XYZ file of C-alpha atoms in Angstrom:
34
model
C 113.151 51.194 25.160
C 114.962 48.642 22.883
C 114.669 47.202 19.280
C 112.037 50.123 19.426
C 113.787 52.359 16.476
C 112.534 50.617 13.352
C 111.262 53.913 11.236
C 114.403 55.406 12.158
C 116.662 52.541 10.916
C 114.507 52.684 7.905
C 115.289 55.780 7.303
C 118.728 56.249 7.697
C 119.278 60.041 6.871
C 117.449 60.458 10.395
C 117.007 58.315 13.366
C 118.761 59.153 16.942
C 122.550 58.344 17.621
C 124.092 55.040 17.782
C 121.378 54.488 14.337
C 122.876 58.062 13.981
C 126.214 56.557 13.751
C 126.168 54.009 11.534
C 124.372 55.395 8.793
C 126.458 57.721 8.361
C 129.369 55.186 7.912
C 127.277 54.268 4.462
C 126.285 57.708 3.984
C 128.788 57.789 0.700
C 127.220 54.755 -0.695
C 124.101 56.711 -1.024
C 126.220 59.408 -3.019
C 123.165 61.665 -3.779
C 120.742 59.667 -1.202
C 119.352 57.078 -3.066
């Protein structure tokens, strides 16, 4: 579907691949996750 990945956006760590892809491009600012 579409606009259907909202625990998986909230998440971050974990969600698919294009959410999977972006997360990781503020994975540093995390540092120790959270």
């Amino acid at each position: 579907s579409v606009s259907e990945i909202q625990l998986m956006h909230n998440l971050g760590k974990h969600l698919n691949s294009m959410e999977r892809v972006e997360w990781l491009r503020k994975k540093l600012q995390d540092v120790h996750n959270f």
